Design a protein around this nucleic acid. Structure first.
Lengths: 177, 165
DNA sequence: ACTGATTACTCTTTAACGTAT
DNA sequence: ATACGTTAAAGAGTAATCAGT
């Protein structure tokens, strides 16, 4: 039971988790709202996940990350709690990945740029052209998350598939009209 | 409405011979003018929400049968509006464009009105709305869910005051 | 009165799907 | 494969209510 014991929280690292939340609760909530959002953009974490896990309101949340819409300390604490825990989950997600022993896919900005330029060359890409974009996009989402491309399976639902690539061109071609 | 019982068939029959995007911009203009929510459409007609919005706003095509259900509702709808304004679905209020520039203009003059300013602004907004729908401002009870009230003016100025954040 | 916090509702956007070649 | 025609899901904007100042 080695890996699951890493997974368990050492009492000291638990006090660190709680300490970080208290620190942010004394910082500018607008300042911490930026980084929560930017992190949610770095890993393309739907707010619905936060709304589901936290118990907050999508609008109050959306308002609080898009604008400096204030929110009471108790509710912000839940967001801050979820934040520090998710950091560990995504860390393991990638770490415990690449080896063998209900979120929706969302196109990341880096991949989007890759795809747009490719659409200019050939709007209806060959299957091999499509696959070569998958890895190139996967790598870009990997380096955007600061992880090695090897741990691409950690992207989870945000893992680019050849089917998803073709769809992008398909919908974007469908948007020609 | 037997006098026009088949006129409406002629309307929808015309409309479906008509260009799809043209009739789509038309109903949206109609909905925007009377501030009718797309919900009520989706509720009565039964077409998919996303499809309707993607069609009324961008030109996404749909089958004539589904298109006919919209046209049938559009023709129908005209009757209730005119009949109800003449008479003089818990839909939610929505501010109409002419009413906003009125309220916005009043904003710079006074961020925090008092009661008498709010209620005078009411009628002014109810005017423009009745005018925007080509009906005498006397028939404002027909605006119904879109009838401006004082509490709404306070809420408007309130919410617009929270803009600072 | 009013700020303040909070929310149900409405709708545009998005990725995905099936059908009929 | 491709085009369509169609849509569940995600999020931001809108109007609103309750309560502590």
């Amino acid at each position: 039971p080695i890996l699951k014991e890493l997974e368990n929280l050492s009492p000291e690292e638990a006090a660190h988790q709680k300490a970080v939340v208290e620190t942010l609760l004394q910082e500018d909530p607008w300042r911490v709202a930026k980084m929560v959002k930017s992190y949610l953009q770095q890993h393309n974490i739907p707010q619905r996940e936060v709304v589901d896990t936290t118990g907050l309101n999508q609008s109050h949340l959306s308002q609080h990350l898009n604008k400096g819409t204030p929110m009471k300390t108790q509710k912000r604490a839940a967001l801050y709690t979820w934040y520090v825990r998710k950091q560990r989950e995504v860390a393991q997600q990638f770490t415990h990945a690449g080896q063998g022993g209900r979120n929706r896919f969302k196109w990341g900005p880096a991949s989007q740029q890759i795809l747009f330029q490719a659409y200019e060359r050939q709007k209806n890409p060959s299957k091999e052209e499509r696959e070569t974009l998958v890895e190139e996009c996967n790598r870009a989402e990997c380096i955007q998350r600061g992880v090695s491309p090897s741990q691409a399976q950690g992207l989870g639902s945000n893992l680019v598939t050849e089917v998803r690539v073709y769809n992008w061109f398909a919908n974007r071609r469908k948007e020609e009209a």
